[PDB]
């Protein structure tokens, strides 16, 4: 109960649409009451609403051209019908969220994207206005669609994204209407659009978007979110901003925005956005493309800001989760960026910072070193064991097995470990015996070999960015292992 | 005869589609003869075919949702119906080519683009295959649509272009099926897509497209087109290639393709593609972004190739039109690029070329100078007159009047004139008294003031690229007038 009892529904739906079609033609604009016929046909949307839940035979909907007509109706003179098609669409796409079956959805989705669903959605979305509680709920469900479409098959999101929605998402946030549950959701959907998608990063930037991002986070510079909903949004604005930064051209744009300045302010005043503020910084400096960003940082006393967080980490603990490797990971990586990138008069300041107070900072580095190495050492034994145990079991170590293993090293802080070794090295090739001595003086004292450190660099270098290009990749890899000689 | 006699047609058309719709549902795949009903409904397309010619009431077609359904049918299990919708679509878009009326088309078009017409066209286009003479004619008419849509409102072309068609256009040309009337047309439509559109240039390049372009022109390196149709295509491949080059990133890509090398080959063997080959070169070198391209040129004996064409221009005359300023314009501009751009060991070679044979090349430059100045002088008197005459008439000189005037100076070779003055200057700031003397020795002798030349530079500098950015613009402008002191 049932199969194809719906197929009457589909047939009925078409017959409905048609009769409406002819009726609209008969009655010229300004005919008040041809309406009941129009209203009646959308009761059948609401009925079809029930369709989703039925074990999906979604193919019915597409070959029999429900989809198309449906999409068609997203443009209708009256919004109630549009809204109705969206609302319906949410529920075939949420339920679709179910792990299985795939056949119904995989054909359905396919159809929607073939039909430029988003293009159409946004058109509707554009006219949809005035926060009539019913209108408002319409956009939300529009967004919903996207989330669901994006969650399931995250490609329709890029093409669909550009089609229009991305543009609109950008407008809504800038809107000077007060914060509401919908402004939030855009934020959710933006981040999704950018999640792992370079083209959408290029597009957002190509729309003065980073200014927008920045401004929105701007307002919360000196004072926390009023609600824990408003917070969730903030954090979505952050995730979005980072994702763009992973795209290289956004870097200059972030810089022409007072991106550093502000992330610095947010750091200088230590609540509560401090935590992500630092995660942005990391990203803005990360590559060679992070290179002006690194210089600018230093020029605005970025060093005064960062190094303290190097010497000591909070909060032990703050209920919002900013700890505790998370924090070090980003600090180190920033330092690691700066050393690799920085040159000239800014480089030198950095290095001085490593000779301060009898190279307290180098003492610090090594405290961090053993901490994380201890961690990892131990991590690895565990894995050794499970490797041996897998041979007894006769379980084959596997690409998916090595996935699970990598994560464990990461969880143990492999990434920070590298960065601190890298740094360590990067400082031992600055021709300052003080630090070189210190490092070595501390490895001796005791029980840790330099070569242990080198084994890690090589691992760091092997993978060494994942990845720009095999030219950039092997060029860098040279560079990195290059330091290993004078180390 | 008639109005809305068609509106029966529209109503009929819908009723047709519907009945087909239900019939397709009734009969499962593998039912051989439900067909007559399907065939019958497309006679009404062919009837509607007649609609276009009727004074356009095209709005009827869109509010009454002919468009949408139509678009809908671009996807149909049987191609005859698809083809039919395209063929129909050609004829509402060609006739539409008529200067007026606008109301019918402006609404129609609007609808099509709102409906992702191209996306849909290309889908059809993708399945359309096998050069069934009828299929083949289908793509052609697909292309036709685009031309017409693009001619009328050249924005739908970019968005539509990216939607899919641009991708396909790129595939078709690379296809190793022999040359035919359709391969040609793509070529026409490519060029249109790129005509004045930066995004499409970015897209083409982002698809290894320039390799394609280059290869296609590649085959005709050492030997002319077999037909004068194949020629027309070649020349479309050129126009396309140039247009991309106007986009900066295509420059490196053109370079990583052996773009120079080949355009050089095509020059070295002087037929018949020589003419455009040189026009490409110009473009590849034009800006600061032309700067590696300028260096590479010199490194491959580009100077040996270019300067001869400087000293003497053919053909006096070759029936294909490559003359006669057209040719000089490009030579000069190339030299002008090289002087502005070139530095180091390549710059010097260039300059030597200006001291050769007692600076024969400088003698040459001045021959060109007076020639073009003579031309322009005279051009300007004519305009003065019409300016005076317009005051008597009481006709106001006008932005559209200044448009007509500019063209006349251009026709008289303003652009080459600047370039040669620019060059002249660029050579008089190389600290080589020989040339500086010569220039001056020749202006004296006689009757031409240096300042006359300066007045032109300023005009050149004022406009001076149209334009990258007011920073780049006023930066350059400084540069240019900078030379005017030591001149």
Curated annotation (Swiss-Prot), chains A, B:
Q: Which GO terms describe its molecular function?
A: enzyme binding
Query: According to the record, where are the ARM repeats?
Result: 102-152, 153-197, 198-247, 249-287, 288-341
Keywords from the UniProt entry = Acetylation, Adaptive immunity, Coiled coil, Cytoplasm, Disease variant, Immunity, mRNA processing, mRNA splicing, Nucleus, Phosphoprotein, Repeat, Spliceosome
Please indicate if the UniProt record lists Cell wall biogenesis/degradation as a keyword. no
Sequence positions bearing N6-acetyllysine:
15
GO CC list: centrosome; cytosol; membrane; nucleoplasm; nucleus; Prp19 complex; spliceosomal complex
The disorder this protein is implicated in is:
Immunodeficiency 99 with hypogammaglobulinemia and autoimmune cytopenias: An autosomal recessive immunologic disorder characterized by recurrent sinopulmonary infections appearing in early childhood, B- and T-cell lymphopenia, and progressive severe hypogammaglobulinemia with decreased memory B cells. Patients may develop autoimmune cytopenias, such as thrombocytopenia, or autoimmune features, such as vitiligo.
Q: What does this protein do?
A: Component of the PRP19-CDC5L complex that forms an integral part of the spliceosome and is required for activating pre-mRNA splicing. Participates in AID/AICDA-mediated somatic hypermutation (SHM) and class-switch recombination (CSR), 2 processes resulting in the production of high-affinity, mutated isotype-switched antibodies.
Subunit (UniProt): Component of the PRP19-CDC5L splicing complex composed of a core complex comprising a homotetramer of PRPF19, CDC5L, PLRG1 and BCAS2, and at least three less stably associated proteins CTNNBL1, CWC15 and HSPA8. Interacts directly with CWC15 and CDC5L in the complex. Interacts with AICDA; the interaction is important for the antibody diversification activity of AICDA. Interacts with PRPF31 (via its NLS). Interacts (via its N-terminal NLS) with KPNA1 and KPNA2.
Q: What is this protein called?
A: Beta-catenin-like protein 1
Q: Which organism is it from?
A: Homo sapiens
